[PDB]
């Protein structure tokens, strides 16, 4: 089969950390695909815990590095007409949103297409209209942003209804690994020069959500999905139809009440321990992404961590968690 691919990304020290000359307890070595953590002692002598992953990125990693090495390959499979999912997992403040969405560089330095701080989502949409418009492919693109807060579903892209409007989900009559999400708005994206606008509306809606729900940005789970309908007309004249779907999942903070987060962990454990029963149905998150966990979707997890000594317990928790997920087998 194809085991779930797991990569670790350690973010750098923030400006409010360097002024204190903070000592890092995290060492990354991409070539060895390892991440080493200082668990005690001194900088002259100490013990450490090491873990090997499918890939490892350190503080110096740029957004372009992440996209080229992990996303590009995945997007290509999506273009081939396959289903793919990428999870962002880790403690609040470690880089989940930065990685999945990115942000705008300060003082309007670049346009959104050239902003080096752009994350996976914008780069993906942009490239999509770049690699397909390149070919004589007849294609369409739809996006949806589904968010889960306290086990309730919200549409963060519907410009018609406000966030407070919760959605309903049901099991799909056909697909046994799928569900039906009543009301989930799907937005057609005609061209890259329409991408930014769609994302801005999402960010804006997220602000109203923050107002209404406590610690919304750290406790919610978000699923940004992109579906590509393609009518390919190869140079040989044959017209092949393909449907590609990609799920960019930004999970709630993992730091020590969140039924979806608890269940995801239990689903992963059940899968790795080969336990007969997998509790997918015990949460909205796992029911919605059932196929991404031991199913027929290509899945990858980007675990984000802090290099600060103060986050040791949480960083170790994140690594152990990510480490275990490597043993999951999809098809």
Q: Which is nearer to ligand ADP, 14 or 175 (CB)?
A: 14
User: Does the annotation list 94 as a binding residue?
Assistant: yes
Nearest-angstrom CA–CA distance, 158 and 155: 6
Measured CA distances, 34 to 1, 8, 55, 129, 327 (Å):
24, 9, 8, 35, 17
150 binds, among ligand EMQ, ligand ADP, none (CB under 5 to 8 A by kind): none
- Is residue 106 near ligand EMQ by the rule CB under 6 A? yes
Stretch that binds ligand ADP, among 86-94, 174-182, 203-211, 283-291 (CB under 6 A): 86-94
Q: Is 118 helix (H, G, I), strand (E, B) or coil?
A: strand
206 binds, among ligand ADP, ligand EMQ, none (CB under 5 to 8 A by kind): ligand EMQ
Query: Contacts with ligand ADP in 95-114 (CB under 6 A)?
Result: 95-98, 103
Stretch that binds ligand EMQ, among 10-18, 104-112, 127-135, 321-329 (CB under 6 A): 104-112
Q: How many CA atoms within 13 Å lie on the side-chain side of 305?
A: 33
Nearest-angstrom CA–CA distance, 275 and 263: 15
102 binds, among ligand EMQ, ligand ADP, none (CB under 5 to 8 A by kind): ligand EMQ
User: Does the annotation list 96 as a binding residue?
Assistant: yes
Q: Which is nearer to ligand ADP, 132 or 252 (CB)?
A: 252
Q: Is 225 helix (H, G, I), strand (E, B) or coil?
A: strand
Q: Which is nearer to ligand ADP, 61 or 330 (CB)?
A: 61
- Is residue 122 near ligand EMQ by the rule CB under 6 A? yes
Taking the complex as a whole, the smallest distance from the CB of residue 119 to ligand EMQ amounts, in Å, to 6
- Is residue 202 near ligand EMQ by the rule CB under 6 A? yes
11 binds, among ligand EMQ, ligand ADP, none (CB under 5 to 8 A by kind): ligand ADP
Structure tokens at 173: 């009559």
For residue 187, list its beta bridge partners: 143
Query: Contacts with ligand ADP in 6-65 (CB under 6 A)?
Result: 11-12, 14
- Is residue 93 near ligand ADP by the rule CB under 6 A? yes
DSSP structure string for 54-92: SEEE-TT--HHHHIIIIIHHHHHHHHTT-EEEEEEEEST
CA nearest neighbour of 119 among 136, 143, 100, 147: 100
CA nearest neighbour of 302 among 254, 250, 253: 250
Taking the complex as a whole, the smallest distance from the CB of residue 321 to ligand ADP amounts, in Å, to 14
Q: 101 with 198: CB under 8 angstroms?
A: no
Burial of 305 (0-12, 13-18, 19+ CB in 10 A): buried
For residue 241, list its beta bridge partners: 231
- Is residue 112 near ligand EMQ by the rule CB under 6 A? yes
Q: Which is nearer to ligand ADP, 195 or 302 (CB)?
A: 302
Terminal CA-to-CA distance of the chain, rounded, Å? 5
307 binds, among ligand EMQ, ligand ADP, none (CB under 5 to 8 A by kind): none
Q: Cα angle at 246 between 167 and 191, to 5 degrees?
A: 90
Binding site for ligand ADP (CB under 6 A): 11-12, 14, 90, 92-98, 103, 304
Binding site for ligand EMQ (CB under 6 A): 101-104, 106, 112, 115, 117-119, 121-122, 145, 199-200, 202-203, 206, 224
Binding residues for ATP: 90-97
Binding residues: 90-97
């Amino acid at each position: 089969g194809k085991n779930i691919q797991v990569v670790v990304r350690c973010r750098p020290f923030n400006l409010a950390e360097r002024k204190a000359s903070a000592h890092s307890i995290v060492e990354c070595d991409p070539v060895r695909k390892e991440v080493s953590v200082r668990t005690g002692g001194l900088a002259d002598k100490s013990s450490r815990k090491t873990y090997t992953f499918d890939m490892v990125f350190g503080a110096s990693t740029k957004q372009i590095d992440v996209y080229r090495s992990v996303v590009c390959p995945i997007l290509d499979e999506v273009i081939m007409g396959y289903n793919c999912t990428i999870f962002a997992y880790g403690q609040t403040g470690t880089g989940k949103t930065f990685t999945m969405e990115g942000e705008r560089s300060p003082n309007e330095e670049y346009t959104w297409e050239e902003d080096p701080l752009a994350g996976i989502i914008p780069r993906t949409l942009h490239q999509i209209f770049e690699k397909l418009t390149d070919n004589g492919t007849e294609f369409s693109v739809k996006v949806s942003l589904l968010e889960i807060y306290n086990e309730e579903l919200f549409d963060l892209l519907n410009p018609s209804s406000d966030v407070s409007e919760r959605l309903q989900m049901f099991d799909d009559p056909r697909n046994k690994r799928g569900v039906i999400i009543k009301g989930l708005e799907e937005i057609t994206v005609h061209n890259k020069d329409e991408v930014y606008q769609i994302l801005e509306k999402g960010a804006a809606k997220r602000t109203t959500a923050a107002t209404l729900m406590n610690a919304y940005s750290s406790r919610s789970h978000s699923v940004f999905s992109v579906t590509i309908h393609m009518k390919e007309t190869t140079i040989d004249g044959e017209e092949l139809v393909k449907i590609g779907k990609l799920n960019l999942v930004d999970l709630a903070g993992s730091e020590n009440i969140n039924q979806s987060l608890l269940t995801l962990g239990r689903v992963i454990t059940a899968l790795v321990e080969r336990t007969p029963h997998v509790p997918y149905r015990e949460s909205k998150l796992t029911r919605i992404l059932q196929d991404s966990l031991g199913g027929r979707t290509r899945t990858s997890i980007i675990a984000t961590i802090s290099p600060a000594s103060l986050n040791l317990e949480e960083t170790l928790s994140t690594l152990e968690y990510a480490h275990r997920a490597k043993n999951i087998l999809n098809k």
